[PDB]
């Protein structure tokens, strides 16, 4: 059994201003009774509105997640949130805590590219985005077409990996249709990272041409 507690996404924290953190439990046997999952704050202030989601898996392991909204100011102020997982089969409970990371801050560098036209795909084109040299690793990457943000399933983004420099880097790949770029030939790659100034947003535009 493994348990992961994530920090708020930079988007939810700085744009939506409704941050949530998620406590994820995996590889627990389906036969097992439900795991009781609870929250605690170092301050003693209440935690509430946590949502619990169970989902079967193809691998054969049941996955349980709990999302707890957190105050943006509470989070930035340094609150420590803690997630506790208890199972009847486990003699003792697992405990995970999360807090705002301290360390150097670097704004992300953003580059957007358009793939050259390829034979047989006249009506298809791929757009690429490279975001790098930012730290800490916490980042959110969105694609906006026509001033309106594109769904998260339209693009694929990698996990932050270490660079030869001190920053992290991610790659984002978006397939866009010919009908879309003929309506408007401009597409925006946006990163949200706390070190970006102002508003924690850095973005680049790319055009098909």
């Amino acid at each position, epitope marked *: 059994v493994s348990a992961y507690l994530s920090r708020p996404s930079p988007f939810d924290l700085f744009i939506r201003k409704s941050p949530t953190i998620t406590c994820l439990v995996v590889d627990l046997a389906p036969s097992k009774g439900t795991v009781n999952l*609870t929250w*605690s*704050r*170092a*301050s*003693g*202030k209440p935690v509430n509105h946590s949502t619990r989601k169970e989902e079967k898996q193809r691998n054969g392991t049941l996955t349980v997640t709990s999302t707890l909204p957190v105050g943006t100011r509470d989070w930035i102020e340094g609150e420590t949130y*803690q997630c*506790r997982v*208890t199972h009847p089969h*486990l*003699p*003792r*409970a697992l*405990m995970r805590s999360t807090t705002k990371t301290s360390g150097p801050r670097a704004a992300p560098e953003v580059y957007a590219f358009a793939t050259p036209e390829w034979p047989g795909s006249r009506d298809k084109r791929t757009l690429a985005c490279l975001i790098q040299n930012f730290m800490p690793e916490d980042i959110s990457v969105q694609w906006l077409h026509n001033e309106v943000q594109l769904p998260d399933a339209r693009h694929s983004t990698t996990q932050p990996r270490k660079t030869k420099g001190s920053g992290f880097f991610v790659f984002s790949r978006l397939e866009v249709t010919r009908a879309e770029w003929e309506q408007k030939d401009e597409f925006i790659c946006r990163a949200v990272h706390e070190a970006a100034s102002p508003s924690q947003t850095v973005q680049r535009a790319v055009s098909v041409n």
Partner: antibody
Amino acid sequence: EVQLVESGGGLVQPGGSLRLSCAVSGYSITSGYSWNWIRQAPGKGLEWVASIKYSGETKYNPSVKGRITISRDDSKNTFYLQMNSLRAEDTAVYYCARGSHYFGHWHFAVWGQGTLVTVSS
Amino acid sequence: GSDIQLTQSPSSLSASVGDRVTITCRASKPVDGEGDSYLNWYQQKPGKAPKLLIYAASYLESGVPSRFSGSGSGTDFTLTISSLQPEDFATYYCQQSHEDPYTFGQGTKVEIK
């Protein structure tokens, strides 16, 4: 960071009353955590005396309950320990501490230097 | 009487820099709840106020060196300093926060030889 300073210690007659105050700086005693008074008798173990939560609940140790009162003053960001009917056994060093919270249980993460109460003739 | 009694051993011990030290804390009643043990460990150097090392039996307090570790369950808890240091000359207290009132142990003085 958070700082806690005890004051009001001194020589006290047996059977007299005592007022101890803990001045908190860097954090608001109404913003979070539990706020406690803990005493250590000379060359003896620590004894937990009383606590006031940020939201206002108070708890007392049965060993001293009935002659001990805990109160706070939000404007002065200070909390108090009032003791009457003092006895020689009440002689101790009194510390104030801020307790951090873990799933319904509190531990004392930040401490003051403490003030000495001597009750004896 | 109705309070939870916390007993430590050894009462006092002398060690060297680099050595491993082990302190035991025994409770009259179990302090287990919800898969955790609400037993904390404090370090109090001479003339200073205590300092928190471990909370809930085995969780290290932020900024406390990794050579301190807590373990145990029920009524048997153990603080272990893997490599004793000169600044670890102190008295060590365990404290249960499971049941009111919270009580401390009597203390274990660790002298460096």
